[PDB]
Amino acid sequence: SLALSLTADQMVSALLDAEPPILYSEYDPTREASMMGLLTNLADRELVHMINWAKRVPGFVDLTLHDQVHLLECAWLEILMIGLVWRSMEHPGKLLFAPNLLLDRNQGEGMVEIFDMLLATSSRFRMMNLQGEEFVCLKSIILLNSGVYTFSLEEKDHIHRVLDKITDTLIHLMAKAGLTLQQQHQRLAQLLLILSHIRHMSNKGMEHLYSMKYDLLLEML
Amino acid sequence: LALSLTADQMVSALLDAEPPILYSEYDPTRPFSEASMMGLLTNLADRELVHMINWAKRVPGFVDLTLHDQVHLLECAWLEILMIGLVWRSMEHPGKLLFAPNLLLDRNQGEGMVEIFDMLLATSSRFRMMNLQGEEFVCLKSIILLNSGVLEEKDHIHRVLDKITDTLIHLMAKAGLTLQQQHQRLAQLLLILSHIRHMSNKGMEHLYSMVVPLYDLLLEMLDAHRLHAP
Ligand SMILES: Oc1ccc(C(=C(Cl)Cl)c2ccc(O)cc2)cc1
Numbered sequence A: 001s002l003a004l005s006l007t008a009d010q011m012v013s014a015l016l017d018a019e020p021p022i023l024y025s026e027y028d029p030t031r032e033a034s035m036m037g038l039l040t041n042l043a044d045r046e047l048v049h050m051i052n053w054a055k056r057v058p059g060f061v062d063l064t065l066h067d068q069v070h071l072l073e074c075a076w077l078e079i080l081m082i083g084l085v086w087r088s089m090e091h092p093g094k095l096l097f098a099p100n101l102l103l104d105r106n107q108g109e110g111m112v113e114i115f116d117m118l119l120a121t122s123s124r125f126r127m128m129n130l131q132g133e134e135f136v137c138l139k140s141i142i143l144l145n146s147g148v149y150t151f152s153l154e155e156k157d158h159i160h161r162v163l164d165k166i167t168d169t170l171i172h173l174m175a176k177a178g179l180t181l182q183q184q185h186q187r188l189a190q191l192l193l194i195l196s197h198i199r200h201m202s203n204k205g206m207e208h209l210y211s212m213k214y215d216l217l218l219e220m221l
Numbered sequence B: 001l002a003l004s005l006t007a008d009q010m011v012s013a014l015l016d017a018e019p020p021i022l023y024s025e026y027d028p029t030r031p032f033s034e035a036s037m038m039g040l041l042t043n044l045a046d047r048e049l050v051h052m053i054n055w056a057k058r059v060p061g062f063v064d065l066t067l068h069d070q071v072h073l074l075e076c077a078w079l080e081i082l083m084i085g086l087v088w089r090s091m092e093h094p095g096k097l098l099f100a101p102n103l104l105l106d107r108n109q110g111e112g113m114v115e116i117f118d119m120l121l122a123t124s125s126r127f128r129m130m131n132l133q134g135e136e137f138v139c140l141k142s143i144i145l146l147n148s149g150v151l152e153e154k155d156h157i158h159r160v161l162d163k164i165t166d167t168l169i170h171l172m173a174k175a176g177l178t179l180q181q182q183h184q185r186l187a188q189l190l191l192i193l194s195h196i197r198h199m200s201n202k203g204m205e206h207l208y209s210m211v212v213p214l215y216d217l218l219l220e221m222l223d224a225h226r227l228h229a230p
């Protein structure tokens, strides 16, 4: 596990380098059972990239296959959502699901509360001046903190140590950016508190998906 | 004045404001059925709710918010608040959930509840494993309240949240932790809050598929005009 020996810069470079691409919504001019189909199809494609992203998250492959599957199983929607919020950040009042799918709230059945929360997190990130380097650290934290409470025991400890490294990385990014010590802790806290909003958003999102109606996962890991 | 508090004054304010520990109704009718246990828990929850509202009003910055925002924060946080309290109480009772000194329950006593209990016990164990301190607990609880549903007081709320962060840090420094340990523990603590949110959503899921008089209580007790509510 060279992962516990990574420096702040190495962790960032690894994470930046592992970023999935921004995918496009399926193009077909003729055509919300259709609108949800657009989002589900984007989601499925995004999932493939996410799983291979997860394998490049330092310390992730050191885990057993059982736990890798479980972490991804708990965090996938949270991860999809934070990506979405990151993409929408420079489009106030709009959610950028894809470059060719930029929806306002007016265009958002039980998705309305979801969108408003997503939009609010987007603006929150906007006024915090969230940086790409910080964003990838956060995304990684979601992956690892997803189902750690729930699930070798040593396995839990490895996760915890890597989380500590990501915390150090975040702090280092802020110090370099010239934040004072006090400012560093406050912003660390602000970022992490937004993670609970993300979890909330995911839970509500995961119980609307059930108002409708694994293999591929173990396959790739 | 709220935003003018030192760390030390902030922590003693929160400690002074702590609600009491309540006892479950003494209808000990055991063994429990689903109806009887939920009946008992709900009655406990309802009585705690009263004390929670009083507590909230003493959290620095809370009464600064509009009535609508006070109600919203409590609506969003109340179950998270009850659950963190339970986790704190159960901390020195491994394998058990101390809902009340007279209502100790283990996993083999909880039934969609089982999953929720398992989550509560895991968190409780996590608290123990990182040696969570009373001063830290009260900070986290206030953060849960102010972060549950956080347009001029979105900024006022964030100012108070910052002061609470400064207080948690200050407590860790006083304790003698290095700066690196401070940052790391702060992170570990706040990351737990995402799990508490999760357990709360799952709990609210179990409840609503089956209660507490939240809206009316807030109306009675958040009424600045009422002197002896509810
Ligand atoms: O990049 C994203 C793609 C879809 C979504 C969905 C939301 Cl906000 Cl509900 C979504 C995910 C899975 C689905 O089957 C439908 C929508 C979120 C982010």
Ligand SMILES: Oc1ccc(C(=C(Cl)Cl)c2ccc(O)cc2)cc1
Pocket (backbone or CB within 6 Å): B038, B041, B042, B044, B045, B048, B082, B083, B085, B086, B099, B116, B203, B207, B211, B212
């Ligand atoms: O101090 C507590 C009391 C009850 C509970 C409940 C759980 Cl764990 Cl589900 C609870 C809350 C509201 C209810 O109507 C029933 C149970 C949690 C903490």
